[PDB]
Ligand binder design. Structure first.
Ligand SMILES: CCCCCCCC/C=C\CCCCCCCC(=O)O[C@@H](COC(=O)CCCCCCCCCCCCCCC)COP(=O)([O-])OCC[N+](C)(C)C
Ligand SMILES: CCCCCCCC/C=C\CCCCCCCC(=O)O[C@@H](COC(=O)CCCCCCCCCCCCCCC)COP(=O)([O-])OCC[N+](C)(C)C
Ligand SMILES: CCCCCCCCCCCCCCCCCCCC(=O)O[C@H](COC(=O)CCCCCCCCCCCCCC)COP(=O)(O)OCCN
Ligand SMILES: CCCCCCCCCCCCCCCCCCCC(=O)O[C@H](COC(=O)CCCCCCCCCCCCCC)COP(=O)(O)OCCN
Ligand SMILES: CCCCCCCC/C=C\CCCCCCCC(=O)OC[C@H](CO)OC(=O)CCCCCCCCCCCCCCC
Ligand SMILES: CCCCCCCC/C=C\CCCCCCCC(=O)OC[C@H](CO)OC(=O)CCCCCCCCCCCCCCC
Ligand SMILES: CCCCCCCC/C=C\CCCCCCCC(=O)OC[C@H](CO)OC(=O)CCCCCCCCCCCCCCC
Ligand SMILES: CC(C)CCC[C@@H](C)[C@H]1CC[C@H]2[C@@H]3CC=C4C[C@@H](OC(=O)CCC(=O)O)CC[C@]4(C)[C@H]3CC[C@]12C
Ligand SMILES: CC(C)CCC[C@@H](C)[C@H]1CC[C@H]2[C@@H]3CC=C4C[C@@H](OC(=O)CCC(=O)O)CC[C@]4(C)[C@H]3CC[C@]12C
Ligand SMILES: CC(C)CCC[C@@H](C)[C@H]1CC[C@H]2[C@@H]3CC=C4C[C@@H](OC(=O)CCC(=O)O)CC[C@]4(C)[C@H]3CC[C@]12C
Ligand SMILES: [Ca+2]
Ligand SMILES: [Ca+2]
Ligand SMILES: [Zn+2]
Ligand SMILES: [Zn+2]
Lengths: 675, 166, 675, 40, 47
């Protein structure tokens, strides 16, 4: 028996106010008029009476979209505050125009009429409001130590965050950008960048800021989509405040703008400069032409040096031929790196400091060219973006290992004279370190070729997904390294008392890299190595067996080894499978825009004159007219976009409501004509 | 394709072999890189078949010898290490060059990590996604293939079996 | 310049027919009347004129849902054939009632008005048609060799298939089952079973028949869902043409009907007969009570034998206690099987024929009980469903191995007298075969426990998914066995010339089960074994090396081995991963209905009196009233279901169309009143 | 015959709640305007 | 004989080919000597 009563009692109005509110809601030109006259004379009705469910007389008159009752209430001095916002949110032009011609609320007090109009994204209401000289407060910069931001955040943090989000939502509407900004493309780019960088700062309101940034990027892409000619697209892309706006969009990570089909057409025509209709030809003749131009890599580079402006000197200046020549030079470098480890060119293996062979003497200009190119990349173009590549770390590692190999070879040549057999050299002979670093640099140089996958149409998205899933490999190795450190600590602590010597063990071998694996858990480094190698099954089971008859210690060690194997394989590897499968499933939707953005960024790196020579040969010693043309193009694009959007806003629901309103008005007019 | 249960299975097999073909390019690039590095590091300590026991020089012996001495043998060793058939002591040289052995073992471990933990599970994710996409349109493809097999037996040409067609 | 003309010219009517058709379409009581009078007198208008887009005057009058023009056209002798079907498909009651009161077509000639009414699933139209004494032709049985089916299929197969599908779609409508059938539950069960079995026969029209079977099953479940009392549910489930209708639904594989919550309540109350509120108690006290009743398994079975109708004799007759006693007896059997291979009970290991030990003497009554229970299961209950279990094959294998072990032990006892050490026994000694078959039967008996997973709430759907994915394991092993046979044939053909002898090989071992693996590909059986064991990495690499210096043969063999390893692991295992992941993703939706059906089928196996004793102790020596009650229950359920369905058929579209029709009729009536 | 059957099936499968609703409002507005003109 | 089916196979019209009535006609042309091959039991079919 649960008793049910209204615990929050609302002060109900008198019966005289109910008649006035019912006359307002039903709609009557005479009953409301005489009710207001009686309220003026006898004071029977409070004019500012309000329903318990937040509905004043003016709000109900707005909800009925009738202008006569609204005009009479406006002339009868009804409380008009917080009533234009309801008409704006209802999105009716007549009521907003009438209220602009002159307690409880459903809107937060920081909302202005222009802000709500921008939130509702109605073109006519926003235009009619901005004609009345309205302004929006400027949101502050993200990192503020000023008093006006810090004190406001300290006093009322929720109101501050709500006000900032409301302002940024008002500024990000496509209609307000199309009306109030003279450069909607650059405004959309900038607002998308600020909203994306601000979503990470305000990590709790991340979804709304990400949605607003996506809205701005979509508006920029849709504004570019309305181009009806190649001249308009060339004017858009070449506008400088060669392809300036495309470089700006690449800077602001506008992947949807970059991967637009007409932008990709213009980039493809600029890429195949010397080949009219490269996509037209057969794949066999394309492969033959690519092979010929690649095999002509000593050519077209000497000709550039001896005659830059000849018939043949301008052949390498085209971007595709430049890319082919660079790829051919790198493949030739890797071929000589393969040839450097062969018996035909490498002899006299028992000298402490050897002079370089012919293959290494040929390798040296390539290494100097790579070093000089990476040095020039630090200066030319800039330094703040050189580290913002994530491929230049690999190049820096390659060049550092090359320099270390060269320096160690020089030291071993100048301080070691004579010959000595290789078995009696010391552990840290400079020659051995040089041969190790050269091999590591060979691995890095041959793995550098993955960056060329974005040019191909089939290996590009594959490399994009490879990066996507390496981002989760990086997360998985933290848990794996914690588990590895835990079990290594435990196993070394259990097993370090039974450490033997290399002399006692057979073949003078102490470690897990022997025929009979010895001292697998004796030291912490060897324990880490053993627990790493047990993942691939290369650690045998008898390494947990000690010389003495300590069967309890052996059993506890084998149990630790089995628990580590279970945790590190059965749980963790299949967890990694599930993680990468989920990440691949998410990225497979947006996998072609990313590849097209990466391919575009690779294409614009070959457009400029800098770095024309391959690394073998790169070490051998009025604005008003453009602004007005862009302004006409923007005017046409904005008009086309606003027309397409304004009738794409026509909806079955709104059309149906409009038809009922027109039918009701016409029936009432016909009834008044008959009566 | 004639059978009702093994037809779409072979269709999906072709669907995922189309992604096997894409995966082997990255795997072959990684294999060539690590083979080049390991052969360059390890070719100085090449022995002869006479000095090695049982006159065997290679990884197909009881005691695996000269795993990274030549480029062909380095490619074979790095291929066979995927299935765990390459032992760990092949990175150990006769001399006491512990730095060279450590760098070789580190290259071998990095290759094992890249070629198994990253690449095989990447291939798992790729083929799982491709199977999920093709599982919708998997019965129309089989019926088209079965029809194409059926019309190859309708004509009079090739009526005799290959024992009796000559 | 592609010329565009109408290649299929349609004979357009004269301008006099256009006026008549426009007057019919617009709606005019006077223009159509005078047009028909002029057509009667001057023969200016053909009354049966037809639009090019398949629209006669009567069809347009049907589309306008106006009965006056339809009545005048009916009185004016307009061609009425193939016009009731349009009114039925449009689903208007008045036009259908009026046309029932008296070239090109959009309907196939095999469609009758009752069949189209059943296809549209409108209750009022179906009722109004079935009141007019209409019949539906009976579809034939699935396997017909009769002339009337075979000749019709030979002359016109497409028409025959379309007619059969149309008839079965008409019979499967819920409204026709609710009206024309006196037992809608049994009719829905039978029709669902025939449609499910007919979908596999007509394998091309499989989707439609499967959809119709699912529709029938959904109708049966929804008819059961309208029960408002436990008495009605007990009347439904106990109706015999104890739980008879539940057994019928289990026979017809009605998983949705069985897994209904009220049926599961009734089954759960019948299952926990001696425990009022078993789900109420704590899990600890539940485990303690289950352990006590299980450990009392010698008890409650002797008491059943000495006093079946005592206080304690009826305790095991309850289903849950019977299940607990059976599980305890099986676990005790497995415990003695574990004890049989211990040194405490097994001694004198060098006798050719041993007498049985005490553990085997205790095992023998359990084996005899299992054999007698499986023999009784063949006779009691029936034989045609004993093979339709897929668990009785396992039981038959266990009992056959038990009988073989007993017979071999008897033979080895009666023909082998004396002692002999185990190393000089022959390869096929009967004792060794007995010990092998006993171990295989032990494996099978301990793996038999998987069938008890459906009782638990967490391991039931897991076993359902295990069966789901074993169904794809079975598909995968065909490709794997084909690949295995191919590579085994090739490797044996290459390697059989270098076969050695066991004497020449060390330790007199010839095979891959030695310390040094020898002759891995010498014979076809050993090649199959080697290629099987190479999947788990247990085959070493030196087995491809021959004694002679045939490096080309060794290289080709190693290349075959590597290709087999790649195909059988990298492609096939990850393909199997993808297949089972997809199958698990599909079955994870319908994974709880399957488990509840399996748990119900396990529960009804303990309800009956047969097999009350555990296998240790099972070898010790008026219908009119029920029909009328069921009829009242069916009347109430059908009325509730038809009311719920008939206003669930109310839709925004139909209500909106009805409101426009009423508004148009009222406005026309008001205009006629004014005029 | 096939083209006639296909065009009939497609042409009334093109009937949609939105288009039918718009057609009904247009017919209602036209009939109300005609009745008003008849009265006036 | 089936000319338009061969044309549709040439143009890779998989939806046209896998239509149920086309598959019926192909199945009746395939089981020429077995009226009702799908009718029989799987054991007698295997035999
Ligand atoms: C990423 C960016 C950085 C890349 C690396 C830049 C630096 C590169 C190369 C410089 C290496 C150090 C100087 C070697 C010569 C000097 C010397 O006497 O060394 C002493 C110490 O030697 C060592 O401890 C060996 C260090 C090897 C580092 C290899 C890194 C490989 C990274 C792979 C990454 C994949 C010799 O021994 P001792 O003390 O005489 O006894
Ligand atoms: C599934 C349903 C069927 C289940 C099995 C029913 C039959 C069970 C058992 C009967 C086995 C045959 C009779 C053995 C004794 C007779 C004899 O002389 O055998 C001779 C042949 O022996 C063989 O060839 C061994 C056959 C072993 C079969 C094991 C099947 C295990 C199935 C596991 C499935 C998981 C002895 O050798 P010789 O010829 O003297 O030389
Ligand atoms: C004693 C020690 C002995 C050691 C012996 C073994 C040596 C092993 C050497 C090899 C080590 C691993 C090398 C991995 C190379 C590939 C890296 C991933 C490539 C890839 O697909 O992702 C790219 C990132 O790569 C990158 O970010 C490149 C990372 C390069 C790291 C180099 C470290 C040195 C994406 O491309 P993107 O970066 O343009 O994506 C957009 C901007 N984020
Ligand atoms: C010289 C030879 C030496 C051999 C030595 C090795 C011997 C190995 C013995 C063990 C072999 C494998 C046994 C597998 C047991 C489990 C089977 C699957 C169980 C499962 O989850 O699925 C059930 C089916 O099981 C079933 O259908 C049971 C299949 C039993 C097959 C027994 C063959 C003998 C589903 O349950 P459900 O069938 O009720 O599902 C609804 C009606 N379909
Ligand atoms: C960190 C991330 C969270 C991990 C949470 C835990 C995960 C599960 C851990 C399971 C540990 C099992 C240890 C078994 C062990 O040491 O055996 C070796 C030792 C070797 O002596 O085994 C024994 O001593 C007992 C012999 C029977 C082993 C039965 C194992 C049952 C579980 C199998 C799991 C699947 C494989
Ligand atoms: C190409 C495609 C992109 C690949 C990008 C990179 C992927 C990750 C690479 C990780 C390399 C780890 C190398 C470890 C190594 O050489 O160990 C052998 C060597 C053998 O001496 O190990 C050591 O010297 C250190 C012993 C501890 C090893 C800890 C390993 C932590 C990472 C584990 C990952 C999961 C397994
Ligand atoms: C049946 C189902 C469809 C199968 C379709 C085909 C699938 C791919 C087959 C690939 C065969 C590769 C054979 C390699 C081989 O024999 O190596 C052993 C032999 C051993 O001598 O290797 C060589 O002789 C060459 C050494 C380099 C091997 C490079 C392998 C590249 C491909 C790797 C794939 C991933 C692992
Ligand atoms: C499988 C083994 C033998 C690979 C050995 C390494 C190289 C010989 C391969 C690996 C990556 C390959 C590259 C991958 C992608 C491309 C881009 C591709 O670009 C185009 O097709 C041009 C048109 C466009 O830009 O879209 C031209 C070949 C090239 C350089 C490939 C050239 C050959 C490379 C360097
Ligand atoms: C698992 C191991 C024992 C397989 C060994 C190889 C062969 C004995 C198998 C492998 C593939 C099998 C074939 C796979 C598919 C078919 C089609 C199948 O076609 C039908 O059922 C006829 C009706 C139709 O065409 O749909 C008849 C059996 C056949 C030839 C099978 C015959 C037996 C084959 C050749
Ligand atoms: C992990 C190892 C130690 C398992 C060794 C084998 C047995 C000791 C296990 C395996 C399967 C188990 C059974 C799995 C499921 C059930 C059903 C379960 O049923 C209930 O909870 C009763 C209520 C209901 O029917 O829903 C009772 C325990 C039981 C028989 C379990 C008893 C113990 C069993 C036989
Ligand atoms: Ca660089
Ligand atoms: Ca049984
Ligand atoms: Zn500030
Ligand atoms: Zn028949």
């Amino acid at each position: 028996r649960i008793p049910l009563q209204i615990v929050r009692a609302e002060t109900e109005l008198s019966a005289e106010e109910k008649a006035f509110l019912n006359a307002v809601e039903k709609g009557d030109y005479a009953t409301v008029k005489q009710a207001l006259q009686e309220a003026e004379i006898y004071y029977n009705v409070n004019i500012n009476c309000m329903d318990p469910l937040g509905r004043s007389a003016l709000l109900i008159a707005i909800e009925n979209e009738n202008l006569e009752i609204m005009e009479l209430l406006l002339n009868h001095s009804v409380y008009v505050g917080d009533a234009l916002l309801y008409a704006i949110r209802k999105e009716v032009v007549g009521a907003v125009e009438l209220l602009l011609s002159y307690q409880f609320s459903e809107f937060t007090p920081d909302i202005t009429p222009i802000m709500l109009a921008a939130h509702t994204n109605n073109y006519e209401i926003i235009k009619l409001l901005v004609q009345k000289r309205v302004t929006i407060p400027r949101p502050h910069q993200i990192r503020c130590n000023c008093v006006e931001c810090v004190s406001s955040s300290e006093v009322d943090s929720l109101r501050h965050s709500r006000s900032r989000l409301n302002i940024y939502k008002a500024l990000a509407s496509p209609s307000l950008i199309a009306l109030s900004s003279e450069d909607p493309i650059l405004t959309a780019f900038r607002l998308g960048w600020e909203l994306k960088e601000l979503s990470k700062v305000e990590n709790e309101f991340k979804a709304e800021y990400e949605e607003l940034s996506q809205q701005c990027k979509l508006f920029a892409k849709d504004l570019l989509d309305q181009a009806r000619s190649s001249r308009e697209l060339e004017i858009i892309l070449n506008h400088r405040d060669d392809l300036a706006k495309l470089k700006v969009a690449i800077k602001y990570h506008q992947k949807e703008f970059v991967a637009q089909p007409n932008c990709q057409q213009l980039l493809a025509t600029l890429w195949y400069d010397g080949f009219p209709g490269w996509r037209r030809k057969h794949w066999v003749v394309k492969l033959l032409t690519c092979m010929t131009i690649g095999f002509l890599f000593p050519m077209l580079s000497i000709a550039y040096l001896i005659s830059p402006r000849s018939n043949l000197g301008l052949f390498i200046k085209k971007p595709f031929i430049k890319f082919i020549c660079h790829t051919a030079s790198y493949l030739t470098f890797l071929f000589m790196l393969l040839l450097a480890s062969q018996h035909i060119v490498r002899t006299d293996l028992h000298v402490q400091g050897p002079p370089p062979t012919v293959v290494e003497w040929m390798i040296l200009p390539w290494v100097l060219g790579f070093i000089w190119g990476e040095i020039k990349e630090m200066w030319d173009g800039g330094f703040t973006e050189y580290i913002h590549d994530w491929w230049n770390l690999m190049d820096f590692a390659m060049n550092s290992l090359y320099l270390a190999t060269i320096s160690l070879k020089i030291v071993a040549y100048v301080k070691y004279n004579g010959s000595r057999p290789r078995e009696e050299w010391e552990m840290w002979h400079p020659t051995l370190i040089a041969e190790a670093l050269f091999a590591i640099s060979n691995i890095l140089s041959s793995l550098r070729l993955i960056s060329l996958f974005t040019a191909n149409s089939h290996l590009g998205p594959l490399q994009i997904s490879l990066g996507r899933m390496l981002l989760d490999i990086l997360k998985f190795l933290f848990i794996y390294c914690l588990v590895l450190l835990a079990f290594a600590n435990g196993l070394n602590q259990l097993y370090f008392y039974y450490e033997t010597r290399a002399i006692d063990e057979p073949n003078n071998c102490k470690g897990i890299r022997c025929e009979k694996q010895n001292n697998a858990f004796s030291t912490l480094f060897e324990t880490l190595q053993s627990l790493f190698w047990s993942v691939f099954g290369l650690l045998n089971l008898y390494v947990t067996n000690v010389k003495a008859r300590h069967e309890f210690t052996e059993f506890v060690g084998a149990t630790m080894f089995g628990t580590y194997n279970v945790i590190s394989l059965v749980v963790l590897l299949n967890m990694l499978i599930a993680m990468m499968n989920n990440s691949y499933q998410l990225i497979a939707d947006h996998a072609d825009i990313e590849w097209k953005f990466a391919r575009t960024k690779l294409w614009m790196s070959y457009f400029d004159e800098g770095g024309t020579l391959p690394p073998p040969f790169n070490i051998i010693p009025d604005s008003l007219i453009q602004n007005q043309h862009y302004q006409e193009v923007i005017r046409n694009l904005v008009k086309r976009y606003v027309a397409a959007m304004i009738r794409n806003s026509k909806t079955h629901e709104g059309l149906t409501e409009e038809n009922f309103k027109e039918l009701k008005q016409d029936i009432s007019s016909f009834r008044y004509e008959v009566l």
